[PDB]
């Protein structure tokens, strides 16, 4: 099995790039990262900022998560993200996804030692 | 019982200012929406536009929700919103919420007839 760090990562971290380029950012990345292999993931965010960049949000504003727990941290500063969601035309294995760039704050979910991302919450 | 569309209303929408005016936003609107009644609500979105504006939401883009139901909807243009989470001095009845003002597009999930905004999914 993938440790949650790892799988936050691939799931939510493209430092390749500084933003997405086109609209068929999301339908290339969600492929690639493995995320429609048996069935389309409905929601997912890319951050296009560096690991240690998204791994340092661990130390800085300690905010509630959506589900109440009390280990999630809001970036100080906006970052890059793309965030990527099933269309009205996906039905699997075609999945579709529309391609939205944006540059917010990103909340995450902290464990472990090292303490790092887990779950990606929200942007605001 | 409430309404689904009348509970979305006083979660989420704050037409009566074009923005949080001080980090106190977050303090007063939680408690006058009745949203730290028993506990504090952890996290949660008001939208600075008109309620017409954000019903309109529900016969825009639409895109999954993160739930992996397919009636959610996607703002065309950003909206003013205010994030209110809850910060780590928050102490139940003494909450206590970050307040974070951004332009985002929202995610709203639809519902009824007629068909409205029943939840606040997320923003981008
Ligand atoms: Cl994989
Ligand atoms: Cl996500
Ligand atoms: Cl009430
Ligand atoms: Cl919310």
Redesign the interface.
């Known amino acids: 099995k993938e440790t949650a760090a790892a799988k936050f990562e691939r799931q939510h971290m493209d430092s390749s790039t500084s933003a997405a380029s086109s609209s068929n950012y999301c339908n290339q990345m969600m492929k690639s990262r493995n995320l429609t292999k048996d069935r389309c993931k409905?929601?997912n965010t890319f951050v296009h900022e560096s690991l240690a960049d998204v791994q340092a949000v661990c130390s800085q504003?300690?905010?509630?998560?959506?589900?109440?727990q009390?280990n999630?941290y809001?970036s100080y500063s906006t970052m890059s993200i793309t965030?990527c969601?099933?269309?009205?035309s996906?039905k699997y294995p075609n999945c579709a996804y529309?391609t939205?760039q944006?540059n917010?704050?990103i909340?995450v979910a902290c464990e472990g030692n090292p303490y790092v991302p887990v779950h990606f919450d929200?942007?605001?």
Chains 1, 2 share one sequence.
């Not at 969601?85 to 009205?88: D, K, L, P, V």
């Open positions: 409905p929601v504003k300690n905010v509630a998560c959506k589900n109440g009390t999630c809001q965030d969601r099933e269309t009205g996906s529309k939205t944006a917010k704050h909340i929200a942007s605001v």
